[PDB]
Design a binder for this molecule. Structure first.
Ligand SMILES: [Ca+2]
Ligand SMILES: [Ca+2]
Ligand SMILES: [Ca+2]
Ligand SMILES: [Ca+2]
Lengths: 199, 198
């Protein structure tokens, strides 16, 4: 009796992108920009901090594998120096926290690799994946997985509610956070999965 | 694999004779993480506090004894949920080294039962953090479900590269009471940190 909780654009497959390594600089559809330190401007260019989706295709010059799911990944790039704050993706779901339920949140996290005419993609800013109820972070994986250059790994976040959880009935949420702890200060996410199951 | 020294890693200092007896002062070797000023400098039984407690035969709050030795470390927060967080912090004598795999393990405890009419049902949530300097390198934010009166081992891992920004800075550990629900008290024991070349 495992249940899949619906997530909008959970694989960042919207919008469709034709050319390999092409990307948008606007918040992916179905998601909002998590911006507690105002690191990402409201109007983005290739020159600013930004987020969006990117096509990881056959001739990719930045990865050693294809997208964990479908064609696209979601990315967050921060131009500010490390320690400046955090930013990422957030989505508030239509599902609410239910009692005596085990939640399993899985997201693939990616590390860009390579170079481009002076631009170095070596390094990784750190990630955090968090499961929300209302404004409360119920559980989070703060950068526990080592992600080699040009590869992806699946982060798993779990939370188990009791019969009397304070946040019962509040809307579930998901955040995918660029921690900006080092350079290169971009990272990818893909294949967001949330499942619920009675204890 | 090398074990990184941690002072009072099992909260066995100080020795406590009477079962379920406890201290209300910061355990020796540790400091009180207090980013929201929830824990006063002079504590009592009724205020927010932290310390060590003897989990001995016939304990009124756990199914089993301390995960290691006699004592656990505990943090209790009297303020309402959402008021902030508090816990234990210790800066280590070891520094972040390149190409090293770090494994931090801590047992987290959920007090159970009833005492003098008060119910200890519920759990405030925990976070275990591995630090370098002032930076949280990796953390387990409340991922394990901990049944009433039991302990489970939280594992936090971090892998350094050759050019980690924080290389050379002092490693650190935080054990945090998240104050996300009531009962808003929790335990920690058997702190382990190991390093290994990649
Ligand atoms: Ca995808
Ligand atoms: Ca990289
Ligand atoms: Ca102990
Ligand atoms: Ca309890």
């Amino acid at each position: 009796s495992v249940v899949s909780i619906p997530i909008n654009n959970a694989g960042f497959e919207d919008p469709f992108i034709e050319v390999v390594d092409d990307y948008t600089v606007d918040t992916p559809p179905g998601w909002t920009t998590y911006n507690p330190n105002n690191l990402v401007p409201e109007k983005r260019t290739t020159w600013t901090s930004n987020n969006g989706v990117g096509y990881v295709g056959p001739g990719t010059q930045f990865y050693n594998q294809l997208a964990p799911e479908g064609r696209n990944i979601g990315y967050i790039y921060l131009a500010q120096k490390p320690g400046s704050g955090v930013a990422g993706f957030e989505q508030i779901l239509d599902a609410t926290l239910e009692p005596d339920t085990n939640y399993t949140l899985k997201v693939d996290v990616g590390n860009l690799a390579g170079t481009f005419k002076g631009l170095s993609f070596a390094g990784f800013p750190g990630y955090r994946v968090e499961l929300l109820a209302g404004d409360t972070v119920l559980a989070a994986d703060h950068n526990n997985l080592f992600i080699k250059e040009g590869e992806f790994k699946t982060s798993t976040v779990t939370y188990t509610s009791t019969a009397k959880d304070l946040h019962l009935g509040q809307k579930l949420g998901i955040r995918l956070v660029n921690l900006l702890q080092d350079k290169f200060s971009g990272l990818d996410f893909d294949n967001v999965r949330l499942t619920a199951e009675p204890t």
